[PDB]
Amino acid sequence: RECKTESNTFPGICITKPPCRKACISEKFTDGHCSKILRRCLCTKPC
Amino acid sequence: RECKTESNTFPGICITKPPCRKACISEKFTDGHCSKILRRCLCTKPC
Ligand SMILES: CCCCCCCC(=O)OC[C@H](COP(=O)(O)O[C@@H]1[C@H](O)[C@H](O)[C@@H](OP(=O)(O)O)[C@H](OP(=O)(O)O)[C@H]1O)OC(=O)CCCCCCC
Ligand SMILES: CCCCCCCC(=O)OC[C@H](COP(=O)(O)O[C@@H]1[C@H](O)[C@H](O)[C@@H](OP(=O)(O)O)[C@H](OP(=O)(O)O)[C@H]1O)OC(=O)CCCCCCC
């Protein structure tokens, strides 16, 4: 499992992963990716 | 926002919140509650 939340800083619609991943790393998470249907940027890190 | 993940220890279908909240506190989260449709026990804590 991972601990997950929505990015505070990622702007725009989440289309591809790397821009979201990078925003999430800037927010002190280890990764990020797009939510499937709503296209939010979700940040993840170890619990 | 909070950081959220699925409980490792909560047994059974999540029907009511307090049993899930208790399991999540035992896993070093600050709260927990039932996922709406799938009835998982989800734990939460500050990011
Ligand atoms: C009956 C409808 C049910 C409503 C409630 C259904 C639940 C709900 O509304 O929230 C999310 C849902 C889909 O969310 P979306 O795909 O954006 O986000 C995913 C969703 O949150 C999953 O639950 C996550 O898995 P988990 O849980 O972390 O394991 C998954 O994380 P990951 O796997 O990507 O890491 C996320 O990507 O959004 C809609 O259904 C909009 C319906 C559009 C219109 C529908 C109706 C007009
Ligand atoms: C257009 C329809 C497509 C989207 C349909 C809806 C698709 C969808 O995303 O549902 C999620 C469902 C499990 O969702 P479930 O309700 O168990 O869990 C919720 C889900 O994780 C939300 O995204 C969370 O909010 P957030 O994101 O953290 O803010 C919410 O957290 P909280 O608020 O409790 O803390 C959780 O309770 O997983 C499936 O998709 C397969 C089931 C299929 C269900 C229906 C399919 C027949």
Side-chain angles (χ1 to χ4, degrees):
Chain A
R1 66 180 183 181
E2 302 180 282
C3 278
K4 185 162 64 208
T5 196
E6 182 172 17
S7 175
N8 284 342
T9 70
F10 179 81
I13 295 175
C14 196
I15 303 175
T16 62
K17 174 169 170 179
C20 171
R21 169 176 167 81
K22 294 164 191 179
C24 289
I25 288 170
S26 81
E27 294 182 39
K28 301 186 171 10
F29 292 82
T30 60
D31 191 28
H33 66 273
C34 305
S35 86
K36 298 339 200 304
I37 297 173
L38 301 176
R39 314 309 302 183
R40 299 169 294 171
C41 173
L42 302 181
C43 298
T44 58
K45 66 185 178 170
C47 288
Chain B
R1 71 182 178 180
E2 301 194 274
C3 277
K4 180 161 63 204
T5 194
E6 185 175 13
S7 175
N8 283 341
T9 70
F10 180 78
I13 310 302
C14 198
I15 305 293
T16 59
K17 167 171 179 174
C20 174
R21 167 173 170 76
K22 187 176 299 306
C24 293
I25 288 163
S26 80
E27 291 181 40
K28 295 189 180 61
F29 290 83
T30 61
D31 190 26
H33 65 277
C34 305
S35 84
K36 297 180 167 71
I37 297 174
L38 298 170
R39 310 317 299 182
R40 299 169 290 172
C41 174
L42 306 179
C43 300
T44 51
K45 63 178 181 179
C47 291

XYZ file of all heavy atoms in Angstrom:
820
model
N 0.858 -1.224 0.000
C 0.000 0.000 0.000
C 0.872 1.243 0.000
O 2.049 1.180 0.369
C -0.900 0.008 1.234
C -0.136 0.158 2.556
C -1.096 0.170 3.741
N -0.341 0.376 4.985
C -0.895 0.423 6.183
N -2.205 0.261 6.329
N -0.126 0.602 7.254
N 0.276 2.364 -0.405
C 0.927 3.674 -0.335
C -0.012 4.650 0.327
O -1.227 4.424 0.378
C 1.268 4.205 -1.735
C 2.169 3.300 -2.557
C 2.459 3.893 -3.936
O 1.588 3.813 -4.829
O 3.542 4.458 -4.093
N 0.543 5.741 0.846
C -0.286 6.789 1.412
C -0.462 7.782 0.280
O 0.512 8.113 -0.409
C 0.362 7.406 2.639
S 0.032 6.359 4.138
N -1.700 8.210 0.057
C -2.039 8.954 -1.157
C -2.895 10.164 -0.809
O -3.731 10.113 0.116
C -2.810 8.046 -2.113
C -3.123 8.658 -3.456
C -3.470 7.547 -4.467
C -4.751 6.802 -4.075
N -4.701 5.400 -4.587
N -2.708 11.241 -1.572
C -3.516 12.432 -1.383
C -3.519 13.200 -2.694
O -2.744 12.873 -3.577
C -2.947 13.307 -0.233
O -3.932 14.260 0.196
C -1.667 14.038 -0.652
N -4.338 14.245 -2.806
C -4.361 15.052 -4.018
C -3.314 16.169 -3.941
O -3.179 16.843 -2.918
C -5.755 15.651 -4.205
C -5.870 16.460 -5.482
C -7.290 16.880 -5.764
O -8.137 16.830 -4.845
O -7.538 17.261 -6.921
N -2.567 16.347 -5.029
C -1.589 17.425 -5.150
C -2.166 18.800 -4.840
O -3.249 19.147 -5.314
C -1.046 17.426 -6.586
O -0.185 18.533 -6.762
N -1.461 19.574 -4.018
C -1.871 20.961 -3.760
C -1.482 21.929 -4.889
O -2.093 22.998 -5.025
C -1.240 21.465 -2.469
C -1.922 20.899 -1.231
O -3.039 20.418 -1.307
N -1.249 20.977 -0.083
N -0.459 21.577 -5.668
C 0.155 22.547 -6.570
C -0.004 22.228 -8.059
O 0.184 23.111 -8.895
C 1.678 22.706 -6.295
O 2.385 21.523 -6.708
C 1.955 23.003 -4.810
N -0.318 20.986 -8.412
C -0.391 20.649 -9.838
C -1.534 21.428 -10.493
O -2.687 21.331 -10.061
C -0.620 19.142 -10.014
C -0.730 18.732 -11.435
C 0.410 18.540 -12.185
C -1.981 18.570 -12.043
C 0.310 18.184 -13.533
C -2.082 18.215 -13.383
C -0.931 18.021 -14.124
N -1.229 22.195 -11.558
C -2.223 23.009 -12.243
C -2.738 22.249 -13.467
O -2.037 21.381 -14.011
C -1.397 24.221 -12.669
C -0.094 23.567 -13.098
C 0.120 22.427 -12.119
N -3.958 22.541 -13.875
C -4.485 21.946 -15.090
C -5.025 20.544 -14.902
O -5.000 19.985 -13.808
N -5.517 19.984 -16.006
C -5.996 18.607 -16.066
C -4.824 17.628 -16.077
O -3.835 17.842 -16.781
C -6.822 18.439 -17.352
C -8.068 19.325 -17.255
C -7.208 17.002 -17.574
C -8.889 19.331 -18.537
N -4.922 16.555 -15.306
C -3.836 15.581 -15.286
C -3.996 14.697 -16.509
O -4.914 13.888 -16.573
C -3.868 14.758 -14.002
S -2.297 13.845 -13.690
N -3.110 14.872 -17.487
C -3.154 14.094 -18.715
C -2.123 12.962 -18.694
O -2.482 11.784 -18.653
C -2.901 15.027 -19.917
C -3.938 16.154 -19.897
C -2.967 14.228 -21.212
C -3.738 17.219 -20.972
N -0.844 13.331 -18.653
C 0.235 12.346 -18.537
C 0.862 12.343 -17.127
O 0.791 13.331 -16.387
C 1.350 12.622 -19.554
O 1.923 13.901 -19.306
C 0.788 12.584 -20.990
N 1.535 11.253 -16.789
C 2.079 11.093 -15.441
C 3.241 12.037 -15.094
O 3.220 12.639 -14.033
C 2.519 9.647 -15.194
C 3.210 9.475 -13.859
C 3.394 8.018 -13.523
C 4.313 7.919 -12.302
N 4.558 6.512 -11.831
N 4.273 12.155 -15.953
C 5.462 12.834 -15.403
C 5.228 14.245 -14.836
O 5.799 14.541 -13.778
C 6.447 12.824 -16.573
C 6.070 11.581 -17.353
C 4.545 11.550 -17.280
N 4.403 15.089 -15.487
C 4.219 16.421 -14.877
C 3.624 16.357 -13.466
O 3.945 17.157 -12.591
C 3.242 17.109 -15.815
C 3.492 16.450 -17.179
C 3.787 14.990 -16.825
N 2.753 15.380 -13.247
C 2.125 15.195 -11.946
C 3.111 14.611 -10.934
O 3.229 15.078 -9.781
C 0.902 14.290 -12.120
S 0.180 13.757 -10.520
N 3.832 13.583 -11.361
C 4.901 13.019 -10.531
C 5.852 14.110 -10.054
O 6.221 14.176 -8.878
C 5.671 11.979 -11.349
C 6.971 11.511 -10.696
C 7.608 10.405 -11.534
N 8.986 10.154 -11.123
C 9.341 9.402 -10.082
N 8.428 8.807 -9.306
N 10.635 9.239 -9.815
N 6.262 14.983 -10.965
C 7.219 16.026 -10.603
C 6.634 17.032 -9.587
O 7.314 17.451 -8.631
C 7.742 16.713 -11.871
C 8.588 15.738 -12.732
C 8.811 16.213 -14.173
C 9.408 15.090 -15.004
N 9.617 15.500 -16.402
N 5.384 17.441 -9.794
C 4.726 18.308 -8.814
C 4.714 17.622 -7.445
O 4.970 18.239 -6.431
C 3.310 18.606 -9.252
N 4.374 16.339 -7.436
C 4.268 15.614 -6.176
C 5.604 15.494 -5.466
O 5.671 15.594 -4.232
C 3.662 14.234 -6.438
S 1.891 14.361 -6.853
N 6.680 15.281 -6.224
C 8.007 15.210 -5.601
C 8.340 16.565 -4.984
O 8.961 16.638 -3.916
C 9.058 14.727 -6.627
C 8.822 13.234 -6.890
C 10.496 14.964 -6.136
C 9.610 12.667 -8.058
N 7.909 17.641 -5.647
C 8.185 18.988 -5.140
C 7.437 19.207 -3.820
O 7.882 20.002 -2.960
C 7.833 20.066 -6.178
O 6.449 20.351 -6.198
N 6.337 18.475 -3.649
C 5.520 18.530 -2.429
C 5.962 17.531 -1.360
O 5.269 17.332 -0.355
C 4.029 18.298 -2.782
C 3.443 19.432 -3.627
C 1.972 19.249 -3.952
O 1.210 18.788 -3.081
O 1.572 19.571 -5.097
N 7.120 16.912 -1.591
C 7.753 15.982 -0.639
C 7.081 14.594 -0.609
O 7.118 13.909 0.412
C 7.851 16.585 0.773
C 8.641 17.881 0.819
C 8.844 18.369 2.248
C 9.823 19.539 2.314
N 10.181 20.110 0.975
N 6.495 14.188 -1.737
C 6.041 12.809 -1.941
C 7.059 12.087 -2.813
O 8.012 12.706 -3.281
C 4.640 12.800 -2.571
C 3.584 13.310 -1.641
C 3.383 14.676 -1.503
C 2.810 12.431 -0.893
C 2.428 15.159 -0.622
C 1.837 12.901 -0.006
C 1.645 14.261 0.132
N 6.923 10.779 -2.981
C 7.922 10.049 -3.774
C 7.461 9.798 -5.209
O 8.256 9.388 -6.039
C 8.318 8.726 -3.126
O 7.170 7.887 -3.002
C 8.911 8.974 -1.747
N 6.183 10.026 -5.493
C 5.651 9.767 -6.842
C 4.302 10.462 -6.978
O 3.754 10.971 -6.006
C 5.502 8.250 -7.055
C 5.222 7.856 -8.516
O 5.623 8.559 -9.468
O 4.591 6.793 -8.700
N 3.777 10.492 -8.193
C 2.429 10.977 -8.406
C 1.883 10.447 -9.717
O 2.660 10.083 -10.578
N 0.560 10.375 -9.858
C -0.030 9.966 -11.127
C -1.456 10.452 -11.244
O -2.022 10.963 -10.286
C -0.028 8.445 -11.219
C -0.925 7.813 -10.207
N -0.509 7.515 -8.925
C -2.231 7.461 -10.266
C -1.513 6.989 -8.247
N -2.571 6.951 -9.036
N -2.027 10.348 -12.440
C -3.369 10.893 -12.667
C -4.465 9.991 -12.143
O -4.442 8.764 -12.330
C -3.608 11.114 -14.166
S -2.334 12.166 -14.949
N -5.473 10.585 -11.526
C -6.655 9.798 -11.148
C -7.415 9.452 -12.431
O -7.415 10.209 -13.407
C -7.525 10.498 -10.086
O -8.474 11.401 -10.624
N -8.008 8.268 -12.443
C -8.370 7.647 -13.720
C -9.446 8.403 -14.492
O -9.306 8.670 -15.684
C -8.865 6.219 -13.474
C -7.855 5.235 -12.846
C -6.425 5.649 -13.031
C -5.471 4.461 -12.859
N -5.629 3.771 -11.545
N -10.547 8.712 -13.816
C -11.689 9.316 -14.469
C -11.693 10.842 -14.333
O -11.874 11.538 -15.323
C -12.995 8.758 -13.892
C -13.064 7.258 -14.177
C -14.194 9.455 -14.515
C -14.225 6.561 -13.524
N -11.461 11.348 -13.119
C -11.567 12.793 -12.859
C -10.302 13.559 -13.249
O -10.328 14.787 -13.335
C -11.891 13.069 -11.389
C -13.195 12.445 -10.898
C -13.333 12.726 -9.406
C -14.358 13.005 -11.667
N -9.209 12.830 -13.488
C -7.945 13.428 -13.965
C -7.374 14.442 -12.957
O -6.809 15.489 -13.325
C -8.097 14.049 -15.370
C -8.836 13.137 -16.382
C -8.253 11.721 -16.440
N -6.832 11.733 -16.784
C -6.104 10.635 -16.954
N -6.655 9.428 -16.800
N -4.812 10.734 -17.260
N -7.487 14.107 -11.676
C -6.747 14.799 -10.623
C -5.290 14.332 -10.626
O -4.994 13.283 -11.178
C -7.352 14.438 -9.260
C -8.796 14.848 -9.118
C -9.401 14.230 -7.858
N -9.488 12.757 -7.927
C -9.814 11.978 -6.903
N -10.065 12.529 -5.706
N -9.883 10.647 -7.058
N -4.391 15.107 -10.016
C -3.023 14.648 -9.763
C -2.961 14.106 -8.333
O -3.194 14.843 -7.390
C -2.051 15.816 -9.959
S -0.370 15.451 -9.484
N -2.689 12.808 -8.195
C -2.615 12.149 -6.887
C -1.151 11.929 -6.521
O -0.387 11.373 -7.318
C -3.339 10.802 -6.935
C -4.815 10.909 -7.349
C -5.478 9.546 -7.356
C -5.552 11.853 -6.405
N -0.768 12.344 -5.318
C 0.591 12.129 -4.832
C 0.650 10.910 -3.917
O -0.288 10.665 -3.163
C 1.046 13.337 -4.022
S 1.081 14.863 -5.023
N 1.749 10.162 -3.979
C 1.916 8.970 -3.155
C 3.287 8.928 -2.486
O 4.287 9.468 -2.996
C 1.734 7.677 -3.984
O 2.680 7.661 -5.061
C 0.302 7.577 -4.537
N 3.326 8.310 -1.312
C 4.589 8.058 -0.627
C 4.372 6.862 0.302
O 3.242 6.455 0.551
C 5.044 9.299 0.160
C 4.118 9.650 1.335
C 4.533 10.950 2.031
C 3.574 11.286 3.163
N 4.073 12.404 4.021
N 5.461 6.277 0.802
C 5.308 5.198 1.781
C 4.598 5.662 3.031
O 4.811 6.788 3.496
C 6.752 4.842 2.138
C 7.570 5.297 0.946
C 6.866 6.517 0.424
N 3.786 4.783 3.587
C 3.124 5.060 4.850
C 4.107 5.099 6.014
O 3.787 5.680 7.051
C 2.035 4.036 5.098
S 0.658 4.354 3.962
N -6.477 18.468 3.006
C -6.269 17.064 2.522
C -5.673 16.228 3.655
O -5.105 16.776 4.610
C -5.330 17.055 1.311
C -3.876 17.372 1.674
C -2.983 17.394 0.440
N -1.609 17.737 0.795
C -0.602 17.826 -0.071
N -0.790 17.574 -1.371
N 0.601 18.169 0.365
N -5.807 14.907 3.530
C -5.129 13.982 4.436
C -4.504 12.913 3.579
O -4.883 12.714 2.401
C -6.089 13.314 5.419
C -6.836 14.281 6.295
C -7.500 13.577 7.442
O -8.626 13.091 7.252
O -6.875 13.489 8.519
N -3.550 12.211 4.161
C -2.926 11.095 3.480
C -3.750 9.873 3.859
O -4.143 9.714 5.018
C -1.447 10.985 3.847
S -0.467 12.131 2.808
N -4.065 9.039 2.873
C -5.028 7.961 3.091
C -4.522 6.654 2.476
O -3.872 6.660 1.440
C -6.364 8.370 2.459
C -7.457 7.370 2.605
C -8.815 8.040 2.375
C -8.965 8.602 0.967
N -9.987 9.694 0.984
N -4.833 5.541 3.113
C -4.436 4.233 2.613
C -5.387 3.179 3.175
O -6.208 3.477 4.031
C -2.976 3.872 3.007
O -2.538 2.741 2.229
C -2.881 3.499 4.472
N -5.286 1.946 2.707
C -6.175 0.894 3.220
C -5.547 0.174 4.424
O -4.385 -0.202 4.391
C -6.471 -0.134 2.117
C -7.496 -1.194 2.548
C -7.884 -2.142 1.409
O -7.192 -2.136 0.373
O -8.871 -2.875 1.571
N -6.353 -0.020 5.460
C -5.946 -0.731 6.672
C -5.339 -2.106 6.365
O -5.928 -2.899 5.620
C -7.164 -0.949 7.568
O -6.821 -1.728 8.696
N -4.220 -2.431 7.013
C -3.652 -3.764 6.870
C -4.326 -4.798 7.770
O -4.285 -5.987 7.473
C -2.150 -3.748 7.186
C -1.322 -3.175 6.057
O -1.780 -3.104 4.912
N -0.094 -2.745 6.372
N -4.919 -4.331 8.875
C -5.348 -5.247 9.931
C -6.855 -5.369 10.087
O -7.326 -6.357 10.649
C -4.728 -4.862 11.309
O -5.299 -3.630 11.791
C -3.215 -4.776 11.192
N -7.627 -4.391 9.600
C -9.070 -4.438 9.834
C -9.682 -5.660 9.167
O -9.524 -5.856 7.971
C -9.772 -3.190 9.282
C -11.244 -3.203 9.499
C -11.762 -2.885 10.745
C -12.114 -3.506 8.466
C -13.146 -2.886 10.971
C -13.489 -3.509 8.682
C -14.003 -3.196 9.939
N -10.369 -6.498 9.956
C -10.948 -7.711 9.385
C -12.414 -7.456 9.071
O -13.043 -6.593 9.705
C -10.811 -8.711 10.530
C -11.069 -7.887 11.729
C -10.473 -6.498 11.427
N -12.959 -8.192 8.127
C -14.376 -8.063 7.834
C -14.727 -6.890 6.925
O -13.891 -6.049 6.565
N -15.996 -6.853 6.530
C -16.547 -5.741 5.739
C -16.705 -4.496 6.612
O -17.069 -4.598 7.795
C -17.953 -6.120 5.226
C -17.921 -7.491 4.548
C -18.493 -5.052 4.303
C -16.965 -7.566 3.419
N -16.371 -3.328 6.072
C -16.481 -2.101 6.867
C -17.932 -1.646 6.828
O -18.434 -1.214 5.771
C -15.554 -1.002 6.328
S -15.266 0.333 7.575
N -18.610 -1.742 7.972
C -20.007 -1.338 8.056
C -20.117 0.007 8.775
O -20.681 0.963 8.250
C -20.821 -2.376 8.833
C -20.645 -3.765 8.212
C -22.294 -1.998 8.829
C -21.242 -3.892 6.849
N -19.578 0.056 9.992
C -19.605 1.270 10.791
C -18.184 1.792 11.018
O -17.213 1.053 10.932
C -20.245 1.026 12.166
O -19.508 0.026 12.880
C -21.705 0.576 12.008
N -18.078 3.074 11.319
C -16.771 3.700 11.390
C -15.922 3.310 12.629
O -14.751 3.027 12.462
C -16.921 5.223 11.308
C -15.633 5.951 11.704
C -15.663 7.436 11.423
C -14.351 8.073 11.875
N -14.211 9.534 11.505
N -16.485 3.335 13.853
C -15.565 3.210 15.004
C -14.641 1.962 15.010
O -13.483 2.092 15.373
C -16.498 3.259 16.230
C -17.663 4.143 15.753
C -17.848 3.731 14.269
N -15.120 0.785 14.576
C -14.180 -0.350 14.526
C -13.017 -0.150 13.546
O -11.888 -0.618 13.771
C -15.064 -1.533 14.086
C -16.487 -1.093 14.430
C -16.507 0.400 14.278
N -13.300 0.545 12.455
C -12.277 0.863 11.464
C -11.337 1.935 12.003
O -10.097 1.822 11.903
C -12.936 1.339 10.180
S -11.747 1.917 8.936
N -11.909 2.984 12.583
C -11.097 4.000 13.224
C -10.138 3.359 14.262
O -8.938 3.677 14.284
C -12.000 5.065 13.845
C -11.279 6.005 14.799
C -12.191 7.144 15.254
N -11.530 7.858 16.333
C -10.529 8.714 16.145
N -10.176 9.059 14.908
N -9.929 9.287 17.187
N -10.637 2.423 15.065
C -9.791 1.749 16.091
C -8.604 0.972 15.462
O -7.457 1.067 15.936
C -10.681 0.822 16.951
C -9.961 0.203 18.150
C -10.915 -0.632 19.018
C -12.077 0.192 19.607
N -11.665 1.418 20.378
N -8.879 0.214 14.395
C -7.839 -0.541 13.721
C -6.796 0.432 13.161
O -5.590 0.204 13.269
C -8.441 -1.420 12.589
N -7.260 1.534 12.572
C -6.321 2.471 11.956
C -5.448 3.173 13.006
O -4.251 3.436 12.759
C -7.044 3.492 11.099
S -7.832 2.771 9.639
N -6.027 3.486 14.165
C -5.225 4.071 15.245
C -4.153 3.062 15.655
O -3.009 3.431 15.918
C -6.109 4.465 16.451
C -6.924 5.697 16.052
C -5.247 4.741 17.722
C -8.106 5.940 16.973
N -4.505 1.782 15.666
C -3.524 0.765 16.052
C -2.408 0.616 15.018
O -1.368 0.044 15.322
C -4.188 -0.594 16.303
O -4.454 -1.301 15.095
N -2.632 1.124 13.805
C -1.640 1.094 12.742
C -0.894 2.422 12.612
O -0.197 2.652 11.632
C -2.351 0.793 11.411
C -2.885 -0.651 11.348
C -3.575 -0.978 10.049
O -3.091 -0.551 8.984
O -4.604 -1.677 10.095
N -1.064 3.293 13.608
C -0.379 4.586 13.657
C -0.895 5.607 12.650
O -0.136 6.436 12.111
C 1.144 4.410 13.561
C 1.737 3.658 14.779
C 3.281 3.715 14.738
C 3.915 2.999 15.921
N 3.563 1.560 15.949
N -2.206 5.565 12.436
C -2.911 6.626 11.724
C -3.777 7.344 12.723
O -3.917 6.883 13.855
C -3.762 6.019 10.611
C -2.934 5.475 9.491
C -2.387 4.202 9.586
C -2.670 6.253 8.364
C -1.588 3.707 8.563
C -1.872 5.765 7.328
C -1.332 4.495 7.433
N -4.314 8.495 12.356
C -5.084 9.256 13.327
C -6.591 9.053 13.221
O -7.322 9.540 14.070
C -4.771 10.761 13.265
O -5.104 11.268 11.967
C -3.271 11.010 13.559
N -7.058 8.368 12.173
C -8.489 8.124 12.009
C -8.667 7.027 10.966
O -7.727 6.653 10.279
C -9.180 9.426 11.540
C -10.716 9.355 11.561
O -11.321 8.575 12.343
O -11.304 10.115 10.759
N -9.891 6.532 10.828
C -10.193 5.642 9.718
C -11.686 5.606 9.505
O -12.455 5.935 10.411
N -12.112 5.217 8.309
C -13.541 5.103 8.073
C -13.798 4.226 6.852
O -12.851 3.812 6.168
C -14.142 6.477 7.837
C -13.637 7.109 6.590
N -12.443 7.795 6.544
C -14.103 7.071 5.321
C -12.222 8.199 5.305
N -13.209 7.765 4.544
N -15.067 3.920 6.587
C -15.377 2.962 5.518
C -15.353 3.610 4.128
O -15.920 4.707 3.931
C -16.760 2.356 5.725
S -16.958 1.582 7.367
N -14.740 2.936 3.155
C -14.834 3.435 1.774
C -16.286 3.247 1.332
O -16.936 2.268 1.734
C -13.803 2.761 0.838
O -14.232 1.519 0.314
N -16.808 4.215 0.563
C -18.266 4.323 0.374
C -18.904 3.124 -0.323
O -19.883 2.543 0.162
C -18.632 5.595 -0.388
C -18.266 6.886 0.346
C -18.692 8.066 -0.531
C -18.666 9.375 0.246
N -17.265 9.788 0.519
N -18.353 2.740 -1.465
C -18.939 1.677 -2.254
C -18.342 0.318 -1.920
O -19.086 -0.632 -1.729
C -18.732 1.973 -3.741
C -19.466 3.273 -4.100
C -19.149 0.795 -4.616
C -19.232 3.756 -5.511
N -17.012 0.234 -1.811
C -16.367 -1.078 -1.672
C -16.286 -1.541 -0.215
O -15.970 -2.696 0.038
C -14.966 -1.063 -2.285
C -14.933 -0.776 -3.789
C -13.514 -0.544 -4.195
C -15.564 -1.933 -4.585
N -16.551 -0.632 0.732
C -16.598 -0.975 2.151
C -15.253 -1.500 2.664
O -15.200 -2.398 3.528
C -17.701 -2.023 2.440
C -19.083 -1.693 1.876
C -19.501 -0.219 2.072
N -19.562 0.160 3.484
C -19.928 1.363 3.920
N -20.256 2.320 3.052
N -19.981 1.608 5.225
N -14.163 -0.926 2.150
C -12.842 -1.107 2.720
C -12.736 -0.281 3.976
O -13.537 0.639 4.176
C -11.788 -0.624 1.728
C -11.835 -1.409 0.408
C -10.966 -0.712 -0.636
N -11.575 0.554 -1.060
C -10.966 1.436 -1.842
N -9.721 1.184 -2.244
N -11.576 2.586 -2.189
N -11.765 -0.599 4.823
C -11.406 0.287 5.937
C -10.247 1.160 5.478
O -9.178 0.642 5.184
C -11.028 -0.542 7.179
S -10.395 0.442 8.567
N -10.467 2.476 5.375
C -9.425 3.400 4.935
C -8.892 4.173 6.139
O -9.670 4.693 6.950
C -9.986 4.411 3.931
C -10.688 3.781 2.724
C -11.234 4.867 1.781
C -9.737 2.882 2.018
N -7.571 4.250 6.272
C -6.943 4.984 7.379
C -6.429 6.330 6.886
O -6.023 6.444 5.726
C -5.727 4.195 7.889
S -6.154 2.520 8.500
N -6.403 7.337 7.764
C -5.972 8.664 7.339
C -5.072 9.269 8.391
O -5.202 8.955 9.573
C -7.169 9.610 7.109
O -8.027 9.587 8.256
C -7.976 9.177 5.889
N -4.185 10.165 7.954
C -3.323 10.919 8.868
C -2.849 12.150 8.123
O -3.004 12.231 6.908
C -2.130 10.055 9.311
C -1.193 9.647 8.175
C -0.021 8.836 8.724
C 0.956 8.442 7.604
N 2.127 7.655 8.135
N -2.266 13.122 8.834
C -1.767 14.314 8.120
C -0.652 13.945 7.154
O 0.110 13.012 7.426
C -1.195 15.189 9.240
C -1.877 14.725 10.475
C -2.138 13.238 10.292
N -0.558 14.638 6.024
C 0.550 14.382 5.112
C 1.869 14.897 5.676
O 2.935 14.465 5.223
C 0.273 15.013 3.756
S -1.063 14.147 2.911
C -22.789 5.885 -9.037
C -21.642 6.875 -9.104
C -20.642 6.646 -7.976
C -20.157 7.966 -7.389
C -19.008 7.760 -6.407
C -17.829 7.014 -7.027
C -16.519 7.362 -6.318
C -16.116 8.753 -6.726
O -16.918 9.520 -7.219
O -14.750 9.193 -6.561
C -13.813 8.749 -7.522
C -14.607 8.468 -8.780
C -13.639 7.968 -9.830
O -12.464 8.640 -9.433
P -11.091 8.671 -10.264
O -11.057 7.565 -11.290
O -10.836 10.090 -10.687
O -10.085 8.341 -9.072
C -9.791 7.005 -8.676
C -10.660 6.619 -7.489
O -10.478 7.598 -6.447
C -10.289 5.241 -6.969
O -11.152 4.939 -5.865
C -8.823 5.225 -6.550
O -8.418 3.950 -6.041
P -8.316 3.696 -4.423
O -9.733 3.952 -3.980
O -7.343 4.744 -3.933
O -7.731 2.329 -4.318
C -7.933 5.598 -7.745
O -6.591 5.679 -7.275
P -5.385 5.055 -8.136
O -5.753 3.613 -8.315
O -5.446 5.828 -9.428
O -4.188 5.286 -7.264
C -8.318 6.944 -8.345
O -7.620 7.134 -9.589
O -15.085 9.688 -9.298
C -16.291 9.403 -10.027
O -16.740 8.282 -9.878
C -16.926 10.447 -10.927
C -18.150 9.858 -11.622
C -18.447 10.572 -12.937
C -19.957 10.694 -13.139
C -20.683 9.525 -12.476
C -22.159 9.834 -12.225
C -22.670 10.920 -13.154
C -19.177 6.996 -15.050
C -18.993 5.911 -14.011
C -17.518 5.582 -13.818
C -17.087 5.873 -12.384
C -17.803 4.984 -11.377
C -17.134 5.089 -10.009
C -15.728 4.531 -10.090
C -14.998 4.708 -8.780
O -14.009 5.386 -8.677
O -15.413 4.060 -7.578
C -14.382 3.785 -6.659
C -14.594 2.340 -6.360
C -14.305 2.289 -4.866
O -14.645 3.570 -4.303
P -15.131 3.643 -2.760
O -16.442 4.365 -2.701
O -15.002 2.257 -2.196
O -13.969 4.523 -2.124
C -13.969 5.933 -2.275
C -13.011 6.346 -3.395
O -11.708 5.874 -3.057
C -12.985 7.862 -3.495
O -12.185 8.278 -4.624
C -12.466 8.457 -2.210
O -12.480 9.899 -2.220
P -11.144 10.716 -2.592
O -10.904 10.337 -4.045
O -10.071 10.224 -1.658
O -11.508 12.149 -2.459
C -13.362 8.017 -1.038
O -12.688 8.446 0.144
P -13.457 9.142 1.366
O -14.264 10.283 0.836
O -14.388 8.081 1.926
O -12.380 9.476 2.357
C -13.527 6.514 -0.944
O -14.558 6.258 0.017
O -13.674 1.634 -7.186
C -14.130 1.329 -8.538
O -14.031 2.193 -9.392
C -14.722 -0.025 -8.844
C -16.111 -0.071 -8.226
C -17.127 0.324 -9.296
C -18.292 1.108 -8.707
C -19.375 1.357 -9.753
C -19.020 0.730 -11.098
C -20.168 -0.100 -11.638
